[PDB]
Amino acid sequence: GFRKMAFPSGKVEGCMVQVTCGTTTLNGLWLDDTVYCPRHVICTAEDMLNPNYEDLLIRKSNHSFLVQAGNVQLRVIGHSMQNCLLRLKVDTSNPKTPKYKFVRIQPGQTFSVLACYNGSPSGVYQCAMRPNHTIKGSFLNGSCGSVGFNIDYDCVSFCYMHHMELPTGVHAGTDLEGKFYGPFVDRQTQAAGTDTTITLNVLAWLYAAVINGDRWFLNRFTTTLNDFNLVAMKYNYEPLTQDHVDILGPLSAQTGIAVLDMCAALKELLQNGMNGRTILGSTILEDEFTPFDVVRQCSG
Amino acid sequence: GFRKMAFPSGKVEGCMVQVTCGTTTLNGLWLDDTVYCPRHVICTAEDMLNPNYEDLLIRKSNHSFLVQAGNVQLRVIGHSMQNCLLRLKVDTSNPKTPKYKFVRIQPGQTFSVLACYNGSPSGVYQCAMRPNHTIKGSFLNGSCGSVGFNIDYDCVSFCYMHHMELPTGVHAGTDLEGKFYGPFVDRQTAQAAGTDTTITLNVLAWLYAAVINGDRWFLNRFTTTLNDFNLVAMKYNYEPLTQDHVDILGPLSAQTGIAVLDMCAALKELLQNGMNGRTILGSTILEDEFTPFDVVRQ
Ligand SMILES: *[C@](O)(C(=O)NCc1ccccc1)[C@H](C[C@@H]1CCNC1=O)NC(=O)[C@H](CC(C)C)NC(=O)OCc1ccccc1
Ligand SMILES: [Cl-]
Ligand SMILES: [Cl-]
C-alpha cells in the first residue's frame, strides 16, 4: 500500500555530533573536517530575544566550543558564521562522510528528518515543506541542528537544518548554507502565513489512484494552466508552476493522462466535491506524497 | 507535533546482504558469521505450489548460494534451515553487527521496517502487527528478507522477516526463528487472513496524544465501567481492554489528568456517533498503530 516512508538514515547517523557552548547543547553535522550547527548555540537565555550574533561570536574562541561524537571530543581549529549557521573547522575528517550535496528544496517537496538529541539519533520520519515554508515536524527541546535529507543512489542531499518551533506548533529552519526557508529569523520572538494545499502532490495522489485502477474522476475535458491556477487559489490550493508540470511528466507518461487533463479532473473535484465517493480508500485528498514517492512505491 | 516515527536504521543497514540461488535474488541479514534469509530463495517457479523444503535443500550445496555484501562475495561454508528461514554460515564475520536479540512480537505492538531490494536499503517506516497477524506494509518484488526491528538503547531487537503479499495487499512474514506470524504458509497460493480488529489500546494512546497536542473536542463529562466499554468495543470489532492495558495507560492518564475510563467514555461516544466530520491530530479516522510507548517516546 502507500506508507509515508523515510530514507534509510545510516549515512546521516554517521555524521551527527553534539555541539556545546556552556550548558547549551544542540546537534551538528560533521562532513569531512567541518561541523555545521545553528548559530544560536552561542546565545544565552538573555541574548535570545534580540541577539547580536556578530558580537556574541567575537567573544568566542575555538576553545569555547565542545564538539563531541559520542563522548569523544573533536578539537575545533576554526570557526565562522555563514548566515544562520556556524561552520566549525575540526582537526579530524569524518571517516563516515558520505557522498553528499547541499540542496535548497522548494515548497511541496518532501524529505526525511533524523530527529536527534545530544548528537544521538532518536527517530526518522518523512515530512513535506509546506507552501508557507514551515514543516509539520516532531521536534522537542534539544532537537535543533537535526537535519533533513534525501538520498539519490549513494548521494545524500542535505536540505534542512532545524532551528525553531513557531507558536502554532509548526517548525522552521534553514538550508545547509544557513538561509532560512521562509521569512523567519533566529530570534526568540513570529507567524507563518496561512497554509495552502500542495496541488502538485494531490495531482500525484490522483495519478497513483489511476495507476491502481481507481479512475472514476477522470473526465473528457482539459484546462489551461492559468484557468486551473485561478480556480485553485479560490480553494486554497497552491498554483502550479512549470516545474510542477515537469515533475509530473513521468506519471503523465506512465498513465497517458496529460497533466492539464488531470488538472481538469481535479478542478471538477474541487468545484463539485467528492459527493461521498472515495479515492484510494479515502474521502480526503492527500498532499504530502510527491510524484517521486508515488513512482517509488508503485514501481520501485 | 506528532508523527509516526521509525527507529534510525543504520545499525540494521550494516547487516543487509543480497542472496541469490538459481534465478532468485532476495535479501538476507548478516549477523556475525551467519546470513539469515527466506528459505523460498531455493524454490523454482514450479516448486512453489507445494515445495518440499527439506528435499529441495538437501539437493543444494554451499556453492549454490551467492551472497554479496556490496561488491564483495561472502563464501558460504555451511547451511541449515530453521522453520521458514535459511541460516547460511559464511567465512567472514560482520564487524558492523550490532548488539541484538530475536524477539517474537505480539499483536498490537509496533516495529520499524527497513525495506530492502538487492541487499540495498531503500526505505524505513513504522508498522503494527495486526490482531490478525498481518502487517500493512509497502513491499514490492525483491523485498523478501527485509526485516522489522525495534531499538532499545543500542540493542536491536529483530522481530520480523518479510515473505509474502496477500491478495488484499497486506503482508505476512516470520520472526527471526522463521515461524510465521499467523496462519500463513510459504507456498505460492492466494491466502486470506482472519478478520482483523482495531487495536483499542493504541487508539486510546493516540487520543491521549491528541490531548497532549491541544486537541480535546471529543472529550465528554461522562465515564464508563471497563466491562460496559468492552461490550461496546467488541460490538464494533475493537479489541477488549484488559486491566493490564488500563495500567499501561497510567502515565498518559497522569500526564493529562484524564482517567483511562473517562477516555474510554470518549471513545465509546466516537464509536457510536462518529467524528461529525471533525478530525483528531489531522486524522479523519481513529489511528490504531501508535502504542502508549510510541506516544510517550515522542
Ligand atoms: C518475495 O518472495 C520476494 O521479494 N522475492 C524476490 C523476487 C524477485 C523478483 C521477482 C519477484 C520476487 C515476495 C514479496 C512479495 C512480492 C510483491 N510484494 C511482496 O511483498 N513474496 C512472494 O512472492 C511470495 C512467495 C511465497 C513462496 C512465500 N508469494 C506471494 O506473496 O504470493 C501471494 C499470492 C497471491 C495470489 C496468488 C498466489 C500467491
Ligand atoms: Cl493455500
Ligand atoms: Cl452502539
Author numbering:
A (entry chain B): 2 to 190, 192 to 302
B (entry chain A): 2 to 299
Task: Provide the publication's sentences verbatim.
These viral proteases are essential for viral replication, making them attractive targets for drug development (5–7). Therefore, we generated three deuterated variants of GC376 by replacing hydrogen with deuterium at the metabolic soft spots encompassed in the R-site (aromatic ring and benzylic carbon) and evaluated their activity in the enzyme- and the cell-based assays.
The structures of SARS-CoV and SARS-CoV-2 3CLpro in complex with compound 5 also contained prominent difference in electron density consistent with the inhibitor covalently bound to the Sγ atom of Cys145. The benzyl ring in the α-ketoamide region of the inhibitor is positioned near a cleft formed by Asn142/Gly143 in both structures. Substitution of the aldehyde warhead in compound 1 with an α-ketoamide (compound 5) significantly decreased potency, which confirms earlier findings by us that ketoamide is less suitable for coronavirus 3CLpro inhibition.
